[PDB]
UniProtKB/Swiss-Prot annotation:
Domain Bromo: 9-113
Official protein name in the record: Bromodomain adjacent to zinc finger domain protein 2B
Location(s) in or outside the cell: Nucleus
Organism, scientific name: Homo sapiens
Family designation: Belongs to the WAL family.
Domain of life: Eukaryota
Function: Regulatory subunit of the ATP-dependent BRF-1 and BRF-5 ISWI chromatin remodeling complexes, which form ordered nucleosome arrays on chromatin and facilitate access to DNA during DNA-templated processes such as DNA replication, transcription, and repair. Both complexes regulate the spacing of nucleosomes along the chromatin and have the ability to slide mononucleosomes to the center of a DNA template. The BRF-1 ISWI chromatin remodeling complex has a lower ATP hydrolysis rate than the BRF-5 ISWI chromatin remodeling complex.
Entry comment describing in which tissues the protein is expressed: Expressed at varying levels in several tissues, whereas a smaller transcript was expressed specifically in testis.
Subunit structure: Component of the BRF-1 ISWI chromatin remodeling complex, at least composed of SMARCA1 and BAZ2B, which regulates the spacing of histone octamers on the DNA template to facilitate access to DNA. Within the BRF-1 ISWI chromatin remodeling complex interacts with SMARCA1; the interaction is direct. Component of the BRF-5 ISWI chromatin remodeling complex, at least composed of SMARCA5/SNF2H and BAZ2B, which regulates the spacing of histone octamers on the DNA template to facilitate access to DNA.
């Protein structure tokens, strides 16, 4: 509360560390469904159904331009990419399996780097 604070965690490396995670997600062989925004002119139903589209290139631009106020807002966007994927794609599909694989990959890096 006022004048009562927990000891100050060193957050000075968070930006660099989120960048490194994102590089590792970008270079994963199963990243291909997530690298660029879904083309809303060419994929029927996507625009109406997915209220907040997110992809790796859009996260990279937000990260590089100071649009994440903290490491939690960063994780929320990465998770959004996989939540969108599950919303639109059957589990038994190449893209559906890609999303589950990438979510696991992310969550382990996230825990190992920050928890």
């Amino acid at each position: 509360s006022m004048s009562v604070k927990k000891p100050k965690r060193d957050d000075s490396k968070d930006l660099a560390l989120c960048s490194m995670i994102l590089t590792e997600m970008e270079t994963h062989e199963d990243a291909w469904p997530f690298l660029l925004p879904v083309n809303l002119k060419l994929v029927p139903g996507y625009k109406k159904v997915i209220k907040k589209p997110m992809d790796f290139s859009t996260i990279r631009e937000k990260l590089s331009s100071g649009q994440y106020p903290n490491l939690e807002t960063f994780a929320l966007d990465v998770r959004l990419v996989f939540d969108n994927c599950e919303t639109f794609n059957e589990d038994d599909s190449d893209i559906g399996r890609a999303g589950h694989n990438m979510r696991k990959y992310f969550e382990k890096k996230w825990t190992d780097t920050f928890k």
